[PDB]
Amino acid sequence: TEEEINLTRGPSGLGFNIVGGTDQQYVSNDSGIYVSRIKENGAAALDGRLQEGDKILSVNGQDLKNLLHQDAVDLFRNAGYAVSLRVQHNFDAERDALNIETAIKTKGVDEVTIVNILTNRSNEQRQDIAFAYQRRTKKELASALKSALSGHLETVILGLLKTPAQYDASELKASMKGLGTDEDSLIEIICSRTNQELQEINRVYKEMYKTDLEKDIISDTSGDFRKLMVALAKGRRAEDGSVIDYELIDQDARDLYDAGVKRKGTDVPKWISIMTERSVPHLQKVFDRYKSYSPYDMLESIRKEVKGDLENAFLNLVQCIQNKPLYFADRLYDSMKGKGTRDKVLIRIMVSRSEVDMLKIRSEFKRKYGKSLYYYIQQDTKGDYQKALLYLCGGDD
Ligand SMILES: [Ca+2]
Ligand SMILES: [Ca+2]
Ligand SMILES: [Ca+2]
Ligand SMILES: [Ca+2]
Ligand SMILES: [Ca+2]
């Protein structure tokens, strides 16, 4: 609510304290000026309209806009004795929840407004919106949208309503439930996640499904492929050390060579040890030093040495080590380049990465393919589903 308040200044000021400004912003999450306290017997106290927490929108009939804290203090002191204040009595989450509700309950469902809200809010902001929606309607927002939406738009929106660890845990469960294991989706998640992401995934997975992620992996996988996936999911890769171990970079490169191209067969345990335990910056230098010894680089060496799920997992792993944004750019390109769309891949990347490194993915994509990721999404998808993806993309080029 907005009310205009007229006060008369006395020798002790207008009678209230202010906080905020462009140089604060950590006290209010924006640049606005807010009333924090009302001094008793001051002008604002006897008037009774000004409240603690009000946002000062206007003073003497000028909209406060991008003011430093001292600039607002100078504005309140030079306003004269008769001052008019246009005030405003997460309120953002409460508003977004109400509009989503009216959108869901609009005849035919306002899918546009739902997308415009949820795809243009951060993940934490979406959690707040979910809290306010359930308090107001006594119904779960995802459940409501699951009935309201359909098709690929439902998949996107429902994915966005999960925390990052919940979404990754649910996609990992989906890739193993039943008899057919989706190795591509399992490999994509396990290979591309950081130690911090995986430690939280292992925690959330246990809470959601009452079973350790490692145990579901052991059930649905076998062979060296099982060993590589169990190793990566532990999320205890060496953290980036302060020193570059050149001796170890060269020896690791020699060990990868001797384990594969140089011999008949492959010492797969040796490959798993090096590529899961060493830090990522160390392994990037290892893969370059490997080119000094081998006529084929690490990816070509993998194609020549192993096959099937093991090959696919190693190829995805080396790409993520070498260049994670380029990895997702290529997977995005693969999901869209030919007939139809691999929507499950396209959606999972856009949901999971839009708030992590979507600018780097778009940069790599545009430089490699000459057209923006935006463009490719535009061509391959349609409708509010397309609009959702384009918002997660963030912009053209
Ligand atoms: Ca409609
Ligand atoms: Ca539905
Ligand atoms: Ca299965
Ligand atoms: Ca070999
Ligand atoms: Ca296509």
Coordinates of C-alpha atoms and ligand atoms in Angstrom, one line a residue:
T1 CA 0.0 0.0 0.0
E2 CA 1.1 3.6 -0.8
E3 CA 0.2 6.7 1.2
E4 CA 1.3 10.3 1.0
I5 CA 2.4 11.6 4.4
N6 CA 2.8 15.3 5.2
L7 CA 4.9 16.2 8.3
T8 CA 6.0 19.5 10.0
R9 CA 9.7 19.6 10.9
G10 CA 10.7 20.6 14.4
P11 CA 14.1 21.4 15.9
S12 CA 14.8 17.7 16.3
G13 CA 14.2 16.8 12.6
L14 CA 11.3 14.9 11.1
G15 CA 11.5 12.3 13.8
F16 CA 12.6 9.0 12.1
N17 CA 15.7 7.2 11.1
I18 CA 16.6 6.0 7.6
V19 CA 18.7 3.1 6.2
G20 CA 19.6 2.0 2.7
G21 CA 21.0 3.6 -0.4
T22 CA 23.2 2.5 -3.3
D23 CA 26.2 2.2 -1.0
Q24 CA 24.2 0.0 1.5
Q25 CA 22.1 -2.5 -0.4
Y26 CA 23.2 -5.3 1.9
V27 CA 20.6 -4.2 4.5
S28 CA 17.6 -4.0 2.1
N29 CA 18.6 -6.1 -1.1
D30 CA 18.0 -3.0 -3.2
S31 CA 19.0 0.7 -3.4
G32 CA 15.9 2.1 -1.7
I33 CA 15.6 4.3 1.4
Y34 CA 13.6 2.7 4.3
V35 CA 12.3 3.9 7.7
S36 CA 14.0 1.9 10.4
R37 CA 12.8 3.6 13.6
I38 CA 10.3 6.4 14.6
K39 CA 11.5 8.6 17.4
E40 CA 8.8 9.3 20.1
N41 CA 7.4 12.8 20.2
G42 CA 8.8 13.5 16.7
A43 CA 6.6 14.7 13.9
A44 CA 6.3 11.2 12.3
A45 CA 5.3 9.8 15.7
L46 CA 2.4 12.1 16.5
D47 CA 1.2 11.8 12.8
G48 CA 0.9 8.0 13.2
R49 CA 0.9 7.1 9.5
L50 CA 4.7 6.5 9.0
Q51 CA 5.7 2.9 10.0
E52 CA 9.0 1.2 10.6
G53 CA 9.9 -0.6 7.3
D54 CA 8.2 1.8 4.9
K55 CA 10.0 2.6 1.7
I56 CA 10.4 6.3 1.0
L57 CA 9.4 6.6 -2.7
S58 CA 9.1 10.4 -2.9
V59 CA 10.2 13.4 -0.9
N60 CA 8.6 16.9 -1.4
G61 CA 7.4 15.5 -4.7
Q62 CA 10.6 14.0 -6.3
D63 CA 11.1 10.3 -6.8
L64 CA 14.1 9.0 -4.8
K65 CA 16.2 7.1 -7.3
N66 CA 19.8 5.8 -7.1
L67 CA 20.7 7.9 -4.0
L68 CA 23.7 7.3 -1.8
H69 CA 22.9 7.1 1.9
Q70 CA 24.3 10.6 2.6
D71 CA 22.5 12.0 -0.5
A72 CA 19.2 10.9 1.1
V73 CA 20.2 12.4 4.4
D74 CA 21.0 15.7 2.6
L75 CA 17.6 15.5 0.8
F76 CA 15.7 15.1 4.1
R77 CA 17.6 18.0 5.8
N78 CA 17.1 20.5 2.9
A79 CA 13.4 19.6 2.4
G80 CA 12.1 22.5 4.5
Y81 CA 9.8 22.4 7.4
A82 CA 6.7 21.1 5.5
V83 CA 7.8 17.8 3.9
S84 CA 5.6 15.5 1.9
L85 CA 6.5 11.8 1.8
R86 CA 5.1 9.2 -0.6
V87 CA 5.8 5.9 1.2
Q88 CA 5.2 2.2 0.7
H89 CA 3.7 0.3 3.7
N90 CA 9.6 -11.4 0.9
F91 CA 6.9 -9.1 -0.2
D92 CA 8.3 -9.9 -3.7
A93 CA 7.7 -13.6 -3.1
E94 CA 4.2 -12.8 -1.8
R95 CA 3.4 -10.8 -4.9
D96 CA 4.8 -13.5 -7.3
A97 CA 2.9 -16.2 -5.4
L98 CA -0.4 -14.3 -5.7
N99 CA 0.1 -13.6 -9.5
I100 CA 1.1 -17.3 -10.1
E101 CA -2.1 -18.3 -8.3
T102 CA -4.3 -16.0 -10.4
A103 CA -2.4 -17.2 -13.5
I104 CA -3.2 -20.8 -12.6
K105 CA -6.8 -20.0 -11.8
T106 CA -7.3 -17.9 -15.0
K107 CA -9.6 -19.4 -17.5
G108 CA -7.3 -21.4 -19.8
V109 CA -4.3 -20.9 -17.4
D110 CA -2.0 -18.0 -17.9
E111 CA 1.1 -20.0 -18.8
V112 CA 2.9 -16.8 -20.1
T113 CA 2.8 -15.1 -16.7
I114 CA 4.0 -18.3 -14.9
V115 CA 7.0 -18.6 -17.3
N116 CA 7.7 -14.8 -17.1
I117 CA 7.9 -15.1 -13.3
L118 CA 9.7 -18.4 -12.6
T119 CA 12.2 -18.4 -15.4
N120 CA 13.2 -14.8 -14.4
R121 CA 13.9 -15.5 -10.7
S122 CA 16.8 -17.1 -9.0
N123 CA 16.6 -20.6 -7.5
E124 CA 16.5 -19.2 -3.9
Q125 CA 13.9 -16.7 -5.0
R126 CA 11.8 -19.6 -6.3
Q127 CA 12.1 -21.4 -3.0
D128 CA 10.7 -18.2 -1.3
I129 CA 7.9 -18.0 -3.8
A130 CA 7.0 -21.7 -3.1
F131 CA 6.9 -21.0 0.6
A132 CA 4.5 -18.0 0.2
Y133 CA 2.3 -20.0 -2.3
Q134 CA 1.9 -22.9 0.1
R135 CA 1.1 -20.5 3.0
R136 CA -1.6 -18.6 1.0
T137 CA -3.3 -21.5 -0.8
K138 CA -2.4 -24.4 1.5
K139 CA -1.3 -26.3 -1.6
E140 CA 2.1 -27.2 -3.0
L141 CA 3.2 -25.0 -5.9
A142 CA 4.8 -27.8 -7.9
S143 CA 1.8 -30.0 -7.5
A144 CA -0.4 -27.1 -8.6
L145 CA 1.7 -26.4 -11.6
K146 CA 1.9 -30.1 -12.4
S147 CA -1.9 -30.1 -12.9
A148 CA -1.8 -26.6 -14.6
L149 CA 1.0 -27.2 -17.1
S150 CA 1.9 -30.0 -19.5
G151 CA 4.4 -31.2 -22.0
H152 CA 8.0 -30.0 -22.0
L153 CA 7.0 -26.7 -20.3
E154 CA 5.9 -28.8 -17.3
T155 CA 9.3 -30.5 -17.2
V156 CA 11.1 -27.2 -17.3
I157 CA 9.0 -25.4 -14.6
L158 CA 9.0 -28.4 -12.3
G159 CA 12.7 -28.7 -12.6
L160 CA 13.2 -25.1 -11.7
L161 CA 11.1 -25.5 -8.6
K162 CA 13.7 -27.9 -7.1
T163 CA 16.9 -26.8 -5.5
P164 CA 20.1 -27.5 -7.5
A165 CA 20.9 -30.6 -5.3
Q166 CA 17.3 -31.8 -5.4
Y167 CA 17.1 -31.5 -9.2
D168 CA 20.4 -33.3 -9.7
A169 CA 19.4 -36.0 -7.2
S170 CA 16.0 -36.5 -8.9
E171 CA 17.5 -36.8 -12.4
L172 CA 20.1 -39.3 -11.1
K173 CA 17.2 -41.4 -9.6
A174 CA 15.3 -41.1 -12.9
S175 CA 18.3 -42.4 -14.8
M176 CA 18.5 -45.6 -12.7
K177 CA 14.9 -46.4 -11.8
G178 CA 13.5 -49.4 -13.7
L179 CA 15.5 -51.8 -15.8
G180 CA 16.7 -49.4 -18.5
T181 CA 19.6 -47.3 -17.2
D182 CA 20.0 -43.9 -18.8
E183 CA 23.8 -44.0 -18.9
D184 CA 24.0 -40.7 -20.8
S185 CA 22.1 -38.8 -18.1
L186 CA 24.0 -40.5 -15.3
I187 CA 27.3 -39.8 -17.0
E188 CA 26.5 -36.2 -17.7
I189 CA 25.7 -35.4 -14.1
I190 CA 28.4 -37.4 -12.3
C191 CA 31.2 -36.2 -14.7
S192 CA 30.3 -32.5 -14.7
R193 CA 29.6 -31.8 -11.0
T194 CA 32.0 -30.3 -8.5
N195 CA 33.1 -31.8 -5.2
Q196 CA 30.8 -29.3 -3.3
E197 CA 27.9 -30.1 -5.6
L198 CA 28.3 -33.9 -5.3
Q199 CA 28.7 -33.8 -1.5
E200 CA 25.4 -31.9 -1.3
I201 CA 23.8 -34.3 -3.9
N202 CA 24.9 -37.3 -1.8
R203 CA 23.2 -35.7 1.2
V204 CA 20.0 -34.7 -0.6
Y205 CA 19.7 -38.0 -2.4
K206 CA 19.7 -39.9 0.9
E207 CA 17.1 -37.6 2.4
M208 CA 14.8 -37.8 -0.7
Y209 CA 15.1 -41.5 -1.4
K210 CA 16.2 -43.1 1.9
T211 CA 19.2 -44.7 0.2
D212 CA 22.8 -43.8 -0.6
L213 CA 23.5 -42.6 -4.1
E214 CA 26.5 -44.9 -4.3
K215 CA 24.3 -48.0 -3.6
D216 CA 21.9 -47.2 -6.4
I217 CA 24.9 -46.8 -8.7
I218 CA 26.3 -50.2 -7.7
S219 CA 22.9 -51.8 -8.4
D220 CA 22.5 -50.2 -11.9
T221 CA 26.1 -50.4 -13.2
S222 CA 28.8 -53.1 -13.6
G223 CA 32.4 -53.5 -14.7
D224 CA 34.9 -50.7 -14.9
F225 CA 32.0 -48.4 -15.8
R226 CA 30.6 -49.0 -12.3
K227 CA 34.1 -48.3 -10.7
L228 CA 34.5 -45.0 -12.6
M229 CA 31.0 -43.8 -11.6
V230 CA 31.4 -44.8 -7.9
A231 CA 34.7 -43.1 -7.8
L232 CA 33.5 -39.8 -9.3
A233 CA 30.3 -39.7 -7.2
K234 CA 32.3 -39.7 -4.0
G235 CA 33.1 -36.0 -4.7
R236 CA 36.5 -36.1 -2.9
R237 CA 38.8 -35.1 -5.8
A238 CA 41.9 -33.3 -4.6
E239 CA 41.2 -29.6 -4.2
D240 CA 43.2 -27.2 -6.3
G241 CA 46.6 -27.0 -4.6
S242 CA 48.6 -23.8 -4.3
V243 CA 51.5 -25.2 -6.3
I244 CA 52.0 -26.7 -9.8
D245 CA 53.5 -30.1 -9.5
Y246 CA 55.4 -30.3 -12.8
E247 CA 57.1 -33.6 -11.9
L248 CA 53.8 -35.1 -11.1
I249 CA 52.2 -33.6 -14.3
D250 CA 54.9 -35.4 -16.4
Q251 CA 54.7 -38.7 -14.5
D252 CA 50.9 -38.8 -14.6
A253 CA 51.1 -38.2 -18.4
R254 CA 53.6 -41.0 -18.7
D255 CA 51.3 -43.3 -16.6
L256 CA 48.3 -42.6 -18.8
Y257 CA 50.4 -43.4 -21.9
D258 CA 51.8 -46.6 -20.4
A259 CA 48.3 -47.6 -19.3
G260 CA 46.7 -47.4 -22.7
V261 CA 48.1 -46.5 -26.1
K262 CA 51.6 -47.9 -25.3
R263 CA 50.3 -51.4 -24.3
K264 CA 47.9 -54.0 -25.4
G265 CA 44.6 -53.7 -23.6
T266 CA 44.2 -51.0 -21.0
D267 CA 45.1 -50.6 -17.3
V268 CA 41.7 -49.0 -16.6
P269 CA 42.2 -48.8 -12.8
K270 CA 45.2 -46.6 -13.5
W271 CA 43.1 -44.3 -15.7
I272 CA 40.3 -44.1 -13.1
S273 CA 42.8 -43.3 -10.3
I274 CA 44.5 -40.4 -12.1
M275 CA 41.4 -38.8 -13.6
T276 CA 39.2 -39.0 -10.5
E277 CA 41.7 -38.1 -7.7
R278 CA 43.9 -35.4 -9.2
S279 CA 42.7 -31.8 -9.2
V280 CA 41.1 -30.4 -12.4
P281 CA 43.8 -27.7 -13.0
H282 CA 46.5 -30.4 -12.6
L283 CA 44.7 -32.8 -15.0
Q284 CA 44.4 -30.0 -17.6
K285 CA 48.2 -29.7 -17.6
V286 CA 48.5 -33.5 -17.6
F287 CA 46.4 -33.8 -20.7
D288 CA 48.6 -31.4 -22.6
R289 CA 51.9 -33.1 -21.4
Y290 CA 50.2 -36.3 -22.6
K291 CA 50.3 -35.0 -26.1
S292 CA 54.1 -34.8 -25.9
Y293 CA 54.3 -38.6 -25.5
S294 CA 51.3 -39.8 -27.5
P295 CA 50.5 -39.4 -31.2
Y296 CA 46.8 -39.1 -30.1
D297 CA 45.4 -36.7 -27.5
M298 CA 43.4 -37.9 -24.5
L299 CA 40.0 -38.0 -26.2
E300 CA 41.3 -39.8 -29.3
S301 CA 43.2 -42.2 -27.0
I302 CA 40.0 -43.0 -25.2
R303 CA 38.1 -43.8 -28.4
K304 CA 40.9 -46.1 -29.4
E305 CA 41.3 -47.9 -26.1
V306 CA 37.8 -48.5 -24.6
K307 CA 34.2 -48.9 -25.9
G308 CA 30.6 -48.7 -24.6
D309 CA 29.6 -47.0 -21.4
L310 CA 33.2 -46.8 -20.2
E311 CA 34.3 -45.0 -23.4
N312 CA 31.3 -42.6 -23.1
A313 CA 32.1 -41.8 -19.4
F314 CA 35.8 -41.1 -20.1
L315 CA 35.0 -38.9 -23.1
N316 CA 32.5 -36.9 -21.0
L317 CA 35.0 -36.7 -18.1
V318 CA 37.9 -35.4 -20.1
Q319 CA 35.7 -32.8 -21.7
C320 CA 34.5 -31.5 -18.4
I321 CA 38.1 -31.4 -17.1
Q322 CA 39.4 -29.5 -20.2
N323 CA 36.5 -27.1 -20.6
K324 CA 33.2 -27.5 -18.8
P325 CA 31.3 -24.7 -20.6
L326 CA 32.4 -25.9 -24.0
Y327 CA 31.2 -29.4 -22.9
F328 CA 27.7 -28.2 -22.3
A329 CA 27.7 -26.1 -25.4
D330 CA 28.5 -29.2 -27.5
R331 CA 25.9 -31.3 -25.7
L332 CA 23.4 -28.5 -26.3
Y333 CA 24.4 -28.5 -29.9
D334 CA 24.0 -32.3 -30.1
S335 CA 20.5 -32.2 -28.5
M336 CA 19.3 -29.8 -31.2
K337 CA 21.3 -30.2 -34.4
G338 CA 19.4 -33.0 -36.2
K339 CA 15.9 -34.2 -36.6
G340 CA 13.7 -33.2 -33.6
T341 CA 15.1 -32.5 -30.2
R342 CA 16.6 -34.4 -27.3
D343 CA 14.5 -32.3 -25.0
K344 CA 15.5 -34.2 -21.8
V345 CA 19.1 -33.2 -22.4
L346 CA 18.2 -29.7 -23.6
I347 CA 16.0 -29.0 -20.5
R348 CA 18.4 -30.5 -18.0
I349 CA 21.3 -28.3 -19.1
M350 CA 19.2 -25.1 -19.3
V351 CA 17.7 -25.7 -15.8
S352 CA 20.9 -26.8 -14.1
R353 CA 23.4 -24.3 -15.7
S354 CA 21.4 -21.1 -16.2
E355 CA 22.6 -19.8 -12.9
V356 CA 26.1 -21.3 -12.9
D357 CA 27.9 -20.6 -16.2
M358 CA 25.3 -19.9 -18.8
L359 CA 27.4 -16.8 -20.0
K360 CA 30.4 -19.0 -20.6
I361 CA 28.3 -21.7 -22.3
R362 CA 26.8 -19.0 -24.6
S363 CA 30.3 -17.6 -25.3
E364 CA 31.8 -21.0 -26.3
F365 CA 28.6 -21.9 -28.3
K366 CA 28.6 -18.6 -30.3
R367 CA 32.4 -18.9 -31.1
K368 CA 32.2 -22.5 -32.2
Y369 CA 28.9 -22.5 -34.1
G370 CA 28.7 -19.0 -35.5
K371 CA 25.1 -18.6 -34.2
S372 CA 23.9 -18.0 -30.7
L373 CA 22.5 -20.7 -28.4
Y374 CA 19.4 -18.4 -28.3
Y375 CA 19.1 -18.9 -32.1
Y376 CA 19.3 -22.7 -32.0
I377 CA 16.7 -22.9 -29.2
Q378 CA 14.5 -20.6 -31.2
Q379 CA 14.6 -22.9 -34.2
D380 CA 14.2 -26.2 -32.3
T381 CA 11.4 -25.4 -29.9
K382 CA 8.1 -23.5 -30.0
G383 CA 5.5 -21.9 -27.7
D384 CA 5.8 -21.0 -24.1
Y385 CA 8.2 -24.0 -23.8
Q386 CA 10.5 -22.1 -26.2
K387 CA 10.0 -18.9 -24.2
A388 CA 11.0 -20.7 -21.0
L389 CA 14.2 -21.9 -22.5
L390 CA 15.1 -18.6 -24.0
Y391 CA 14.6 -16.9 -20.6
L392 CA 17.0 -19.4 -19.0
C393 CA 19.4 -18.7 -21.8
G394 CA 19.3 -15.1 -20.7
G395 CA 19.7 -13.3 -24.0
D396 CA 20.9 -13.4 -27.6
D397 CA 24.5 -14.1 -28.5
Ligands
CA1 CA -3.9 -20.8 -22.1
CA2 CA 0.5 -31.9 -16.4
CA3 CA 17.9 -49.4 -14.5
CA4 CA 46.1 -50.2 -25.6
CA5 CA 16.7 -30.3 -34.1

